[PDB]
């Protein structure tokens, strides 16, 4: 039955618009298969279309905004795109229709409406690009009746082992098709839909833009060769209309030119299902998905006072839909330095220079292929998996669809190597690499990242203890299903725990360090003079200089998170021997957090280092790091330490801004210095952990219940309202928020853990 649910989840989730790196395209969760993508741009001249055409996601002055209005990966959704440069408001509706043996069928409607600014007779070129990878598969465009191109729909027939037989139709669509009266029309037609069918080696089919341009350039070369010149040139849009040549190939370019508003459909029909998908079917299933989305949202994300109003509901739906709509399927090789150079142990003073030297050996090489099914932080700026971000992404997604979240967890843990390492940034294949400078592609097996995916796991466990609808909760509704999933994952969780303790160990015994346990101590590998990227808090101030005797209180707290999860899950699995070990490790971390990291003078936790005189020294920088044992849920509700931490949290002169908790204290000497990434701004992920922990204290008997209740109420409101006001005013989720002005800054489209606001509004943790 676990096996049954697994197959039903696979069939359910196989198709989607799982290419979040582009405005609109589709692919199945299969490495080498059929992929589609949309391009469009206005053409007003002989040289502008190369500058207007849209394909990969960006965000700049020429794009007002874009994102998912509603989305559910089992069903589909609606995206809206507001393009200033191209004078167009675009809607892309995508819907799935279950049936057959190959993961079902799907449809999309592409609709473009000129805005008030655009010339009414604007010419817009639209391309639907279709590629298929694999050795034993076929795809063919059925030729036109007409001489020069298509009057009606374009039908592609194809076949593969993974998809069986299928057909993909691009419908005639609606809108004016310009007509040229030029001489050229005698040879290229007056203006009509055209199809070019081509082949390239499979590994370059993702390069849709260059492939299209090479075809456009050959058309223009033909014009030049055939005496079409500047004394009497065809119109631009006709110069850029490809010569029709359908056929067999692994690339099919379908092009239309429209004057004024337009729409057309894409109908994918899996032969192994019922009759073929129609436009009427598209429209009916779009209506139905929206109805279902609405009902699930109101149930799963019932927003509490004072956020029950329709404005906050719209906001919550946008924030949530952009998060879950960012899910992608990635496939390909990764760049990894597998030298395990000894410089990477970082055992000496000045280790950063030796690690640099080792990196300058450039021993990294491609490996894989790997696949990953994950939500992402940023469509325009970094559309790929990031390890600790995903833990936050899945917190709302798990509310919506626990089976979906488990599927993504499983995907990530399937990357883990024999040692217990998962690379913190997952850049899979040439297409993903195209968004990343080569200097930042290489992954390092000694680089960790926070194990936030355990938080999602903790939520799953608590729900386990206490057809699309069915599937979405199948792993909690059937406890034997959920337990088996845990049974299979548990070893990898355990491997990861051991990997942390083996590779991220700090040094107690080699110095004059007294502590309850001689084992429990941790130091993030990979730090440079000004950064600790592996911690996730890139430039939060750390001991200077970096030092092999450093100890990091956030890392120890994360190990605490892991061991508590392992206790819960071990207990579930009857892993008695494992659990007693975990228990002693927890006890030891609890004491060592105090003995190595607590500052009585400063009234908070601090990272530690080793002096010029070889002595343990605390290095206090009041900010997120200082609160870590509290944030990660390690402290008793009566802890006097917790009480002081609550005082720091609520202190306007330190962390408390009207807009959320500042990452660093205004009193800290590094407040707002250098790049000021984690040295003042308000970050939603850490504010979220604070909110959840304050609520926990607020809803139990204890000495700090009322303090926590007040702080909870206000921080919740502060954080929600800052994200909401910014979204209202800009249309975007931002990476972080300015604590003096409240304004969103750094990158836009960060959905991304900023989307946690939907769960903060939902409340009742
Ligand atoms: O979310 C993942 C991680 C966190 O896990 C970590 O905790 C958190 O601290 C960091 N954060 C983001 C990491 C990240 C930061 C920046 C970049 C882009 C680098 N250069 C660039 C590239 C492009 Cl394509 C556009 C632009 C751009 N920006 C404004 O205008 N143009 C800039 C990539 C990844």
PDB file of N, CA, C and O in Angstrom, residues 79-125:
ATOM      1  N   UNK A  79      -0.830  31.961 -14.293  1.00  0.00           N
ATOM      2  CA  UNK A  79       0.230  32.918 -14.082  1.00  0.00           C
ATOM      3  C   UNK A  79      -0.140  34.209 -14.804  1.00  0.00           C
ATOM      4  O   UNK A  79      -0.721  34.190 -15.907  1.00  0.00           O
ATOM      5  N   UNK A  80       0.215  35.347 -14.185  1.00  0.00           N
ATOM      6  CA  UNK A  80       0.063  36.582 -14.926  1.00  0.00           C
ATOM      7  C   UNK A  80       1.401  37.329 -15.044  1.00  0.00           C
ATOM      8  O   UNK A  80       2.221  37.321 -14.111  1.00  0.00           O
ATOM      9  N   UNK A  81       1.626  37.904 -16.242  1.00  0.00           N
ATOM     10  CA  UNK A  81       2.890  38.526 -16.610  1.00  0.00           C
ATOM     11  C   UNK A  81       2.560  39.946 -17.079  1.00  0.00           C
ATOM     12  O   UNK A  81       1.739  40.127 -17.987  1.00  0.00           O
ATOM     13  N   UNK A  82       3.203  40.948 -16.452  1.00  0.00           N
ATOM     14  CA  UNK A  82       2.985  42.360 -16.742  1.00  0.00           C
ATOM     15  C   UNK A  82       4.271  42.937 -17.335  1.00  0.00           C
ATOM     16  O   UNK A  82       5.185  43.299 -16.602  1.00  0.00           O
ATOM     17  N   UNK A  83       4.325  43.020 -18.676  1.00  0.00           N
ATOM     18  CA  UNK A  83       5.523  43.334 -19.439  1.00  0.00           C
ATOM     19  C   UNK A  83       5.381  44.761 -19.991  1.00  0.00           C
ATOM     20  O   UNK A  83       4.549  45.010 -20.872  1.00  0.00           O
ATOM     21  N   UNK A  84       6.162  45.693 -19.423  1.00  0.00           N
ATOM     22  CA  UNK A  84       6.153  47.086 -19.840  1.00  0.00           C
ATOM     23  C   UNK A  84       6.832  47.227 -21.198  1.00  0.00           C
ATOM     24  O   UNK A  84       6.281  47.868 -22.081  1.00  0.00           O
ATOM     25  N   UNK A  85       8.012  46.615 -21.365  1.00  0.00           N
ATOM     26  CA  UNK A  85       8.781  46.819 -22.578  1.00  0.00           C
ATOM     27  C   UNK A  85       7.929  46.401 -23.769  1.00  0.00           C
ATOM     28  O   UNK A  85       7.971  47.044 -24.814  1.00  0.00           O
ATOM     29  N   UNK A  86       7.184  45.304 -23.608  1.00  0.00           N
ATOM     30  CA  UNK A  86       6.453  44.743 -24.729  1.00  0.00           C
ATOM     31  C   UNK A  86       4.978  45.156 -24.732  1.00  0.00           C
ATOM     32  O   UNK A  86       4.205  44.667 -25.567  1.00  0.00           O
ATOM     33  N   UNK A  87       4.605  46.067 -23.822  1.00  0.00           N
ATOM     34  CA  UNK A  87       3.258  46.621 -23.764  1.00  0.00           C
ATOM     35  C   UNK A  87       2.185  45.543 -23.584  1.00  0.00           C
ATOM     36  O   UNK A  87       1.083  45.699 -24.082  1.00  0.00           O
ATOM     37  N   UNK A  88       2.480  44.457 -22.852  1.00  0.00           N
ATOM     38  CA  UNK A  88       1.523  43.351 -22.833  1.00  0.00           C
ATOM     39  C   UNK A  88       1.258  42.848 -21.420  1.00  0.00           C
ATOM     40  O   UNK A  88       2.186  42.624 -20.638  1.00  0.00           O
ATOM     41  N   UNK A  89      -0.011  42.519 -21.164  1.00  0.00           N
ATOM     42  CA  UNK A  89      -0.412  41.756 -19.993  1.00  0.00           C
ATOM     43  C   UNK A  89      -0.759  40.365 -20.480  1.00  0.00           C
ATOM     44  O   UNK A  89      -1.634  40.213 -21.332  1.00  0.00           O
ATOM     45  N   UNK A  90      -0.008  39.384 -19.974  1.00  0.00           N
ATOM     46  CA  UNK A  90      -0.109  38.016 -20.437  1.00  0.00           C
ATOM     47  C   UNK A  90      -0.622  37.168 -19.293  1.00  0.00           C
ATOM     48  O   UNK A  90      -0.228  37.388 -18.146  1.00  0.00           O
ATOM     49  N   UNK A  91      -1.480  36.207 -19.659  1.00  0.00           N
ATOM     50  CA  UNK A  91      -1.944  35.161 -18.770  1.00  0.00           C
ATOM     51  C   UNK A  91      -1.531  33.832 -19.401  1.00  0.00           C
ATOM     52  O   UNK A  91      -1.655  33.681 -20.616  1.00  0.00           O
ATOM     53  N   UNK A  92      -0.946  32.930 -18.598  1.00  0.00           N
ATOM     54  CA  UNK A  92      -0.689  31.563 -19.023  1.00  0.00           C
ATOM     55  C   UNK A  92      -1.443  30.645 -18.060  1.00  0.00           C
ATOM     56  O   UNK A  92      -1.143  30.642 -16.879  1.00  0.00           O
ATOM     57  N   UNK A  93      -2.462  29.916 -18.552  1.00  0.00           N
ATOM     58  CA  UNK A  93      -3.214  28.992 -17.704  1.00  0.00           C
ATOM     59  C   UNK A  93      -2.767  27.587 -18.055  1.00  0.00           C
ATOM     60  O   UNK A  93      -2.691  27.250 -19.226  1.00  0.00           O
ATOM     61  N   UNK A  94      -2.489  26.771 -17.043  1.00  0.00           N
ATOM     62  CA  UNK A  94      -1.992  25.431 -17.300  1.00  0.00           C
ATOM     63  C   UNK A  94      -2.861  24.475 -16.481  1.00  0.00           C
ATOM     64  O   UNK A  94      -3.211  24.771 -15.331  1.00  0.00           O
ATOM     65  N   UNK A  95      -3.241  23.348 -17.087  1.00  0.00           N
ATOM     66  CA  UNK A  95      -4.111  22.427 -16.371  1.00  0.00           C
ATOM     67  C   UNK A  95      -3.754  20.992 -16.769  1.00  0.00           C
ATOM     68  O   UNK A  95      -3.365  20.740 -17.901  1.00  0.00           O
ATOM     69  N   UNK A  96      -3.893  20.068 -15.816  1.00  0.00           N
ATOM     70  CA  UNK A  96      -3.562  18.670 -16.010  1.00  0.00           C
ATOM     71  C   UNK A  96      -4.851  17.845 -16.057  1.00  0.00           C
ATOM     72  O   UNK A  96      -5.798  18.136 -15.341  1.00  0.00           O
ATOM     73  N   UNK A  97      -4.867  16.793 -16.873  1.00  0.00           N
ATOM     74  CA  UNK A  97      -6.057  15.961 -16.981  1.00  0.00           C
ATOM     75  C   UNK A  97      -5.615  14.510 -16.849  1.00  0.00           C
ATOM     76  O   UNK A  97      -4.962  13.986 -17.759  1.00  0.00           O
ATOM     77  N   UNK A  98      -5.864  13.877 -15.675  1.00  0.00           N
ATOM     78  CA  UNK A  98      -5.347  12.532 -15.390  1.00  0.00           C
ATOM     79  C   UNK A  98      -5.909  11.503 -16.369  1.00  0.00           C
ATOM     80  O   UNK A  98      -6.944  11.738 -16.992  1.00  0.00           O
ATOM     81  N   UNK A  99      -5.210  10.379 -16.535  1.00  0.00           N
ATOM     82  CA  UNK A  99      -5.697   9.387 -17.487  1.00  0.00           C
ATOM     83  C   UNK A  99      -4.568   8.684 -18.228  1.00  0.00           C
ATOM     84  O   UNK A  99      -3.523   9.289 -18.510  1.00  0.00           O
ATOM     85  N   UNK A 100      -4.806   7.401 -18.555  1.00  0.00           N
ATOM     86  CA  UNK A 100      -3.803   6.590 -19.223  1.00  0.00           C
ATOM     87  C   UNK A 100      -2.733   6.116 -18.248  1.00  0.00           C
ATOM     88  O   UNK A 100      -2.964   6.063 -17.041  1.00  0.00           O
ATOM     89  N   UNK A 101      -1.551   5.796 -18.787  1.00  0.00           N
ATOM     90  CA  UNK A 101      -0.519   5.125 -18.012  1.00  0.00           C
ATOM     91  C   UNK A 101       0.758   5.964 -18.001  1.00  0.00           C
ATOM     92  O   UNK A 101       1.802   5.462 -17.629  1.00  0.00           O
ATOM     93  N   UNK A 102       0.704   7.219 -18.462  1.00  0.00           N
ATOM     94  CA  UNK A 102       1.945   7.922 -18.762  1.00  0.00           C
ATOM     95  C   UNK A 102       1.980   9.280 -18.055  1.00  0.00           C
ATOM     96  O   UNK A 102       2.702  10.205 -18.448  1.00  0.00           O
ATOM     97  N   UNK A 103       1.189   9.373 -16.993  1.00  0.00           N
ATOM     98  CA  UNK A 103       1.166  10.574 -16.177  1.00  0.00           C
ATOM     99  C   UNK A 103       0.190  11.608 -16.722  1.00  0.00           C
ATOM    100  O   UNK A 103       0.306  12.786 -16.393  1.00  0.00           O
ATOM    101  N   UNK A 104      -0.753  11.168 -17.572  1.00  0.00           N
ATOM    102  CA  UNK A 104      -1.872  12.021 -17.950  1.00  0.00           C
ATOM    103  C   UNK A 104      -1.541  13.029 -19.045  1.00  0.00           C
ATOM    104  O   UNK A 104      -0.503  12.962 -19.711  1.00  0.00           O
ATOM    105  N   UNK A 105      -2.513  13.914 -19.274  1.00  0.00           N
ATOM    106  CA  UNK A 105      -2.469  14.939 -20.300  1.00  0.00           C
ATOM    107  C   UNK A 105      -2.454  16.315 -19.633  1.00  0.00           C
ATOM    108  O   UNK A 105      -2.632  16.402 -18.416  1.00  0.00           O
ATOM    109  N   UNK A 106      -2.332  17.377 -20.456  1.00  0.00           N
ATOM    110  CA  UNK A 106      -2.285  18.746 -19.953  1.00  0.00           C
ATOM    111  C   UNK A 106      -2.683  19.724 -21.060  1.00  0.00           C
ATOM    112  O   UNK A 106      -2.614  19.396 -22.239  1.00  0.00           O
ATOM    113  N   UNK A 107      -3.052  20.946 -20.663  1.00  0.00           N
ATOM    114  CA  UNK A 107      -3.409  21.974 -21.627  1.00  0.00           C
ATOM    115  C   UNK A 107      -2.929  23.331 -21.130  1.00  0.00           C
ATOM    116  O   UNK A 107      -2.846  23.550 -19.930  1.00  0.00           O
ATOM    117  N   UNK A 108      -2.678  24.264 -22.057  1.00  0.00           N
ATOM    118  CA  UNK A 108      -2.345  25.604 -21.597  1.00  0.00           C
ATOM    119  C   UNK A 108      -3.040  26.605 -22.496  1.00  0.00           C
ATOM    120  O   UNK A 108      -3.128  26.407 -23.709  1.00  0.00           O
ATOM    121  N   UNK A 109      -3.502  27.695 -21.893  1.00  0.00           N
ATOM    122  CA  UNK A 109      -3.977  28.802 -22.702  1.00  0.00           C
ATOM    123  C   UNK A 109      -3.003  29.959 -22.544  1.00  0.00           C
ATOM    124  O   UNK A 109      -2.695  30.353 -21.416  1.00  0.00           O
ATOM    125  N   UNK A 110      -2.527  30.481 -23.678  1.00  0.00           N
ATOM    126  CA  UNK A 110      -1.693  31.670 -23.629  1.00  0.00           C
ATOM    127  C   UNK A 110      -2.532  32.854 -24.124  1.00  0.00           C
ATOM    128  O   UNK A 110      -3.036  32.835 -25.243  1.00  0.00           O
ATOM    129  N   UNK A 111      -2.670  33.901 -23.310  1.00  0.00           N
ATOM    130  CA  UNK A 111      -3.511  35.024 -23.709  1.00  0.00           C
ATOM    131  C   UNK A 111      -2.748  36.337 -23.544  1.00  0.00           C
ATOM    132  O   UNK A 111      -2.257  36.622 -22.450  1.00  0.00           O
ATOM    133  N   UNK A 112      -2.626  37.134 -24.618  1.00  0.00           N
ATOM    134  CA  UNK A 112      -1.973  38.427 -24.453  1.00  0.00           C
ATOM    135  C   UNK A 112      -2.896  39.603 -24.785  1.00  0.00           C
ATOM    136  O   UNK A 112      -3.533  39.618 -25.849  1.00  0.00           O
ATOM    137  N   UNK A 113      -2.908  40.611 -23.900  1.00  0.00           N
ATOM    138  CA  UNK A 113      -3.742  41.804 -24.042  1.00  0.00           C
ATOM    139  C   UNK A 113      -2.833  43.026 -24.021  1.00  0.00           C
ATOM    140  O   UNK A 113      -2.064  43.206 -23.074  1.00  0.00           O
ATOM    141  N   UNK A 114      -2.872  43.842 -25.080  1.00  0.00           N
ATOM    142  CA  UNK A 114      -2.028  45.028 -25.041  1.00  0.00           C
ATOM    143  C   UNK A 114      -2.489  45.930 -23.901  1.00  0.00           C
ATOM    144  O   UNK A 114      -3.680  45.986 -23.618  1.00  0.00           O
ATOM    145  N   UNK A 115      -1.552  46.636 -23.259  1.00  0.00           N
ATOM    146  CA  UNK A 115      -1.958  47.593 -22.249  1.00  0.00           C
ATOM    147  C   UNK A 115      -2.334  48.903 -22.940  1.00  0.00           C
ATOM    148  O   UNK A 115      -2.220  49.040 -24.167  1.00  0.00           O
ATOM    149  N   UNK A 116      -2.745  49.881 -22.130  1.00  0.00           N
ATOM    150  CA  UNK A 116      -3.229  51.162 -22.641  1.00  0.00           C
ATOM    151  C   UNK A 116      -2.122  51.937 -23.355  1.00  0.00           C
ATOM    152  O   UNK A 116      -2.392  52.762 -24.232  1.00  0.00           O
ATOM    153  N   UNK A 117      -0.868  51.662 -22.999  1.00  0.00           N
ATOM    154  CA  UNK A 117       0.223  52.422 -23.581  1.00  0.00           C
ATOM    155  C   UNK A 117       0.585  51.897 -24.968  1.00  0.00           C
ATOM    156  O   UNK A 117       1.058  52.673 -25.777  1.00  0.00           O
ATOM    157  N   UNK A 118       0.389  50.596 -25.249  1.00  0.00           N
ATOM    158  CA  UNK A 118       0.967  50.034 -26.463  1.00  0.00           C
ATOM    159  C   UNK A 118       0.227  50.578 -27.686  1.00  0.00           C
ATOM    160  O   UNK A 118      -0.991  50.787 -27.642  1.00  0.00           O
ATOM    161  N   UNK A 119       0.923  50.751 -28.836  1.00  0.00           N
ATOM    162  CA  UNK A 119       0.241  51.071 -30.098  1.00  0.00           C
ATOM    163  C   UNK A 119      -0.780  49.971 -30.369  1.00  0.00           C
ATOM    164  O   UNK A 119      -0.474  48.797 -30.149  1.00  0.00           O
ATOM    165  N   UNK A 120      -1.972  50.354 -30.857  1.00  0.00           N
ATOM    166  CA  UNK A 120      -3.094  49.434 -30.987  1.00  0.00           C
ATOM    167  C   UNK A 120      -2.797  48.382 -32.061  1.00  0.00           C
ATOM    168  O   UNK A 120      -3.364  47.290 -32.044  1.00  0.00           O
ATOM    169  N   UNK A 121      -1.907  48.730 -32.988  1.00  0.00           N
ATOM    170  CA  UNK A 121      -1.577  47.864 -34.109  1.00  0.00           C
ATOM    171  C   UNK A 121      -0.211  47.198 -33.889  1.00  0.00           C
ATOM    172  O   UNK A 121       0.381  46.680 -34.832  1.00  0.00           O
ATOM    173  N   UNK A 122       0.286  47.202 -32.641  1.00  0.00           N
ATOM    174  CA  UNK A 122       1.521  46.501 -32.291  1.00  0.00           C
ATOM    175  C   UNK A 122       1.557  45.120 -32.939  1.00  0.00           C
ATOM    176  O   UNK A 122       0.577  44.360 -32.922  1.00  0.00           O
ATOM    177  N   UNK A 123       2.724  44.796 -33.498  1.00  0.00           N
ATOM    178  CA  UNK A 123       3.004  43.435 -33.917  1.00  0.00           C
ATOM    179  C   UNK A 123       3.813  42.716 -32.830  1.00  0.00           C
ATOM    180  O   UNK A 123       4.832  43.240 -32.384  1.00  0.00           O
ATOM    181  N   UNK A 124       3.295  41.562 -32.382  1.00  0.00           N
ATOM    182  CA  UNK A 124       3.964  40.720 -31.397  1.00  0.00           C
ATOM    183  C   UNK A 124       4.281  39.356 -32.024  1.00  0.00           C
ATOM    184  O   UNK A 124       3.376  38.690 -32.544  1.00  0.00           O
ATOM    185  N   UNK A 125       5.555  38.953 -31.996  1.00  0.00           N
ATOM    186  CA  UNK A 125       5.946  37.604 -32.409  1.00  0.00           C
ATOM    187  C   UNK A 125       5.800  36.670 -31.217  1.00  0.00           C
ATOM    188  O   UNK A 125       6.281  36.993 -30.135  1.00  0.00           O
TER     189      UNK A 125
END
